[PDB]
Design an enzyme around this catalytic site. Structure first.
Site, mmCIF file in Angstrom:
data_model
loop_
_atom_site.group_PDB
_atom_site.id
_atom_site.type_symbol
_atom_site.label_atom_id
_atom_site.label_comp_id
_atom_site.label_asym_id
_atom_site.label_seq_id
_atom_site.Cartn_x
_atom_site.Cartn_y
_atom_site.Cartn_z
ATOM 1 C CG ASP A 55 -2.743 -3.398 5.702
ATOM 2 O OD1 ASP A 55 -3.177 -4.516 6.055
ATOM 3 O OD2 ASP A 55 -3.489 -2.438 5.423
ATOM 4 C CG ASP A 104 -7.133 -0.521 6.548
ATOM 5 O OD1 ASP A 104 -7.542 -1.607 7.008
ATOM 6 O OD2 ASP A 104 -7.424 0.585 7.053
ATOM 7 C CD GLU A 130 -10.688 -3.790 5.085
ATOM 8 O OE1 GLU A 130 -10.301 -2.610 5.226
ATOM 9 O OE2 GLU A 130 -10.869 -4.568 6.045
ATOM 10 C CG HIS A 179 -6.518 -8.207 10.553
ATOM 11 N ND1 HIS A 179 -6.563 -8.312 9.179
ATOM 12 C CD2 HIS A 179 -6.633 -6.892 10.837
ATOM 13 C CE1 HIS A 179 -6.696 -7.107 8.655
ATOM 14 N NE2 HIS A 179 -6.741 -6.225 9.635
ATOM 15 C CG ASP A 180 -10.466 -6.419 10.409
ATOM 16 O OD1 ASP A 180 -9.959 -6.146 11.516
ATOM 17 O OD2 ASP A 180 -10.288 -5.717 9.392
#
Ligand SMILES: [Ca+2]
Ligand SMILES: [Ca+2]
Ligand SMILES: [Ca+2]
Length: 546
Positions: A95, A196, A253, A319-320
């Site tokens: 990440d 990210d 992302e 995870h979001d």
């Protein structure tokens, strides 16, 4: 092209596996469960941030890019993880978090030490306006997007939490140091990055106030820093200086990118990323199910990227977000809808991602105390809204149906204490339904959600039509049935999904010399004819046509 055929699995390391009994997941925990991922058929493993961090945002606030978080282990443990992953015929992508750093990162400690210092404009500083913040921008985690520094009498910007100051991408010294850091990791032999919050790096110059039609204390500031004009200059340089030098996969992302403006992100010619996580079907930070709306959105991206030779990143969880069963399926048909959802998103054209627990059909959780939660976003939201007069029940309703913490409860391995995730007290409470939902139980049940994902991965790998076949939407007007085809040469795959908690009738959308049922979640009725499909609640079927 290997990343086109790959199936990815996302690990949230803090909640995957704890190996030393402190309630916190770690790298050696991940290592101990590599057999599980290997036997699942996973090609690529994406691991969430494992770098040195104060954990105000669980790893996404980094204070050292080249050191491992102490909770997770050491660099040697990582090296062991990478070595063991690579020997099992799998790839690892990390990440990459370069929109911001921790406020404890050496750069920022130096930056905040004096109004003038070589690291000051590594971040975004501004003097106040009218005894208040520079502007009315709200942080994504609620509150002001500006934090006051008493020592230098100025504000620093943070799109996210207070302990996550935004990096200044207009400074070439910042970019240079980031590029060096990125290539440092790629030289270690990792296989790529999930990038990210990469769409938040370009700020509107001057950081002007935003329209406030409802006179809020602070204004949602997406129009100030998300996918703003000029961002591609930085991203193109990032690719040229880092990614383009290696044979890796990059997935950005990219919140705020639509299917018609995705060209310079993912196009084969000139794209800065191999693929992106788009959020038009998800919706980040919002506070039955119109199936047709979901059809339109996913089809737009299928048709849209096919036209520019882009590649889709397929997912329903991370995870979001909240669990997909709650968001897209039904808790009354948990097992069935989880499989129906699986076949739906997995067998479209693109690279499918599996979030931990998704293959088990894990669902949302309902904790009564705000103290039982951890998400810096919802904790701030609770505090603010409660002061404004919202009841405890009103706020918990939002947290339960919307809070991303739903996806961060420990991985449910078995029926033992803490579902086998830890011998200690988990950092986040395990979902009570682990006695019914766990890996051990689903491994031995051939009709489990887990084994259904194994079949999906297998049939995708065995049939090129499921990887490179052209997508076409069938029966658009049916509010219950999502049907679509995949076409490659003399092979047509028909994916049928009953996205409703009810029995449904459906004519087979027919011209073939052979037909075969690749996968199905309900036993096949002998008397049933092909043309008249009588589908059970959340029944899914995939036919292969020759
Ligand atoms: Ca641990
Ligand atoms: Ca510039
Ligand atoms: Ca039937």
């Amino acid at each position: 092209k290997w990343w086109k055929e790959a199936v990815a699995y996302q690990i949230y390391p803090r909640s995957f596996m704890d190996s030393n009994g402190d309630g916190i997941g770690d790298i050696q925990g991940v290592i101990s469960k590599l057999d599980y991922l290997s036997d699942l058929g996973i090609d690529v493993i994406w691991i969430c941030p494992i770098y040195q961090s104060p954990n105000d945002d669980n790893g996404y606030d980094i204070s050292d890019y080249k050191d491992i978080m102490k909770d997770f282990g050491t660099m040697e443990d990582f090296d062991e993880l990478l070595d063991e992953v690579h020997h099992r015929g799998m790839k690892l992508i990390m990440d990459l978090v370069i929109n911001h750093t921790s406020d404890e990162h050496p750069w920022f400690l130096e930056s905040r030490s004096a109004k003038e210092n070589p690291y000051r404009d590594y971040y975004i500083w501004h003097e106040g306006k009218d005894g208040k913040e520079p502007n009315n921008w709200e942080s994504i985690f609620s509150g002001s997007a500006w934090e006051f520094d008493e020592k230098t009498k100025e504000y620093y910007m943070h799109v996210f939490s207070k302990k996550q100051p935004d990096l200044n991408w207009e400074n070439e010294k910042v970019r240079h140091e980031l590029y060096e850091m990125v290539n440092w990791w790629l030289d270690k032999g990792i296989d790529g990055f999930r990038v990210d919050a990469i769409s938040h790096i370009k700020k509107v110059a001057g950081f002007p106030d935003l329209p406030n039609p409802e006179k809020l204390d602070y204004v949602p500031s997406f129009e100030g820093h998300m996918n703003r004009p000029g961002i591609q200059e930085h991203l193109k340089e990032l690719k040229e200086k880092t990614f383009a030098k290696y044979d890796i996969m990059t997935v950005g992302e990219a919140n705020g990118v639509t299917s018609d403006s995705a060209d310079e992100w993912v196009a084969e010619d000139g794209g800065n990323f191999n693929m992106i996580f788009q959020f038009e079907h998800m919706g980040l930070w919002d506070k039955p199910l119109d199936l047709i709306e979901l059809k339109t959105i996913l089809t737009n991206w299928q048709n849209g990227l096919e036209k520019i030779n882009g590649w889709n990143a397929l997912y329903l969880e991370n995870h979001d977000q909240i669990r997909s069963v709650n968001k897209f399926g039904s808790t009354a048909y948990r097992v069935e809808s989880a499989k129906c959802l699986a076949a739906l998103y997995f067998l479209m054209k693109g690279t499918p991602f599996i979030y931990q627990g998704q293959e088990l059909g894990m669902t949302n959780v309902k904790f009564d105390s705000i103290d039982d939660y951890d998400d810096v976003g919802m904790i701030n939201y609770y505090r603010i809204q409660r002061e404004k007069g919202d009841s405890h029940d009103e706020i918990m309703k939002v947290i339960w149906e919307t809070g991303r913490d739903n996806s961060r409860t420990p991985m449910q391995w078995n029926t033992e204490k803490n579902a086998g995730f830890s011998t200690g007290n988990p950092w986040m409470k395990v979902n009570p339904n682990y006695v019914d939902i766990n890996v051990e139980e689903q491994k031995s049940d051939k009709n489990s959600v887990l084994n259904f994902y194994k079949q999906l991965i297998k049939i995708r790998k065995q049939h090129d039509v499921l990887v490179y076949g052209t997508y076409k939407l069938l029966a658009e007007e049916d509010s219950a049935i999502y049907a679509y085809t995949r076409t490659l040469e003399g092979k047509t795959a028909v994916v049928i999904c009953n996205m409703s908690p009810n029995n449904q009738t459906f004519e087979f959308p027919s011209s073939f010399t052979n037909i075969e049922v690749l996968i199905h979640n309900y036993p096949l009725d002998k008397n049933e004819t092909l043309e008249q499909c009588t589908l059970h609640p959340y029944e899914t079927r995939v036919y292969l046509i020759s």
